[PDB]
Protein backbone atom coordinates (compact mmCIF):
# COMPACT_ATOMS: atom_id res chain seq x y z
CA UNK A 1 0.00 0.00 0.00
CA UNK A 2 2.68 2.48 1.10
CA UNK A 3 6.46 2.44 0.77
CA UNK A 4 6.69 -1.11 2.11
CA UNK A 5 9.44 -1.81 -0.43
CA UNK A 6 12.11 -0.81 2.09
CA UNK A 7 13.30 -4.37 2.99
CA UNK A 8 13.72 -5.15 -0.69
CA UNK A 9 16.15 -2.32 -1.17
CA UNK A 10 18.20 -2.39 2.07
CA UNK A 11 21.10 0.02 2.57
CA UNK A 12 23.33 -3.06 2.47
CA UNK A 13 22.39 -5.15 -0.56
Coordinates of C-alpha atoms in Angstrom, one line a residue:
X1 CA 0.0 0.0 0.0
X2 CA 2.7 2.5 1.1
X3 CA 6.5 2.4 0.8
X4 CA 6.7 -1.1 2.1
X5 CA 9.4 -1.8 -0.4
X6 CA 12.1 -0.8 2.1
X7 CA 13.3 -4.4 3.0
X8 CA 13.7 -5.2 -0.7
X9 CA 16.1 -2.3 -1.2
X10 CA 18.2 -2.4 2.1
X11 CA 21.1 0.0 2.6
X12 CA 23.3 -3.1 2.5
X13 CA 22.4 -5.2 -0.6

